[PDB]
Each structure stands twice: as structure tokens, then as C-alpha cells.
């Protein structure tokens, strides 16, 4: 598993995007595009722009 942390808030504009709050931690499910599919605190999943995120690293 991979995780990223949000530096900013993000508000979903339609059913497919996913809302996030500053400092939220997210599980990166698909990082292949400009918008990553992530799973947030609610367990739901959706796309969020990656530029608001910082990938978190671990050995």
C-alpha cells in the first residue's frame, strides 16, 4: 500500500470526484494520471487532483 497526504482541501464537482480536507491521509489506488484514484477516510474512492498531494514514503 501507498499513501499521500493532502496539503489542501478539495471539493468534488460531480459524482465521480472525491472530496478531501487539508492534512487528510489517502490511500493511492491508481496514480497513473494527473488525477489519482484514492481511498479517503470514509472508505469511498474517487479521483482527486494529484497536485494538492504529497506522496508519503516508507522503506
From Swiss-Prot:
Residues annotated as domain SH3: 1-58
Tissue: Expressed in neuronal cell body and neurites, and prominently enriched in the axonal growth cone. Expressed at the tips of cochlear hair cells stereocilia.
Post-translational modification summary for this protein: Ubiquitinated by the SCF(FBXW5) E3 ubiquitin-protein ligase complex during G2 phase, leading to its transient degradation and subsequent cell shape changes required to allow mitotic progression. Reappears at the midzone of dividing cells. Phosphorylated by several receptor tyrosine kinases.
UniProt superkingdom: Eukaryota
Disruption phenotype annotation: No visible phenotype. Defects in PDGF-induced membrane ruffling due to defects in Ras to Rac signals. Dendritic cells are impaired in directional and chemotactic migration and are delayed in reaching the draining lymph node in vivo after inflammatory challenge. Mice show short stereocilia.
Coiled-coil annotated residue ranges, if any: none
Compartments, as annotated in UniProt: Cytoplasm, Cell cortex; Cell projection, Ruffle membrane; Cell projection, Growth cone; Cell projection, Stereocilium
UniProt record similarity statement: Belongs to the EPS8 family.
Protein purpose: Signaling adapter that controls various cellular protrusions by regulating actin cytoskeleton dynamics and architecture. Depending on its association with other signal transducers, can regulate different processes. Together with SOS1 and ABI1, forms a trimeric complex that participates in transduction of signals from Ras to Rac by activating the Rac-specific guanine nucleotide exchange factor (GEF) activity. Acts as a direct regulator of actin dynamics by binding actin filaments and has both barbed-end actin filament capping and actin bundling activities depending on the context.
Entry note about domains: The effector region is required for activating the Rac-specific guanine nucleotide exchange factor (GEF) activity. It mediates both barbed-end actin capping and actin bundling activities. The capping activity is mediated by an amphipathic helix that binds within the hydrophobic pocket at the barbed ends of actin blocking further addition of actin monomers, while the bundling activity is mediated by a compact 4 helix bundle, which contacts 3 actin subunits along the filament.
Known partners and oligomeric status: Homodimer. Part of a complex consisting of ABI1, EPS8 and SOS1. Interacts with BAIAP2. Interacts with SHB and LANCL1. Interacts with EGFR; mediates EPS8 phosphorylation. Interacts with MYO15A and WHRN.
Name the UniProt record assigns to this protein: Epidermal growth factor receptor kinase substrate 8
Organism placement in taxonomy: Eukaryota, Metazoa, Chordata, Craniata, Vertebrata
Gene: Eps8
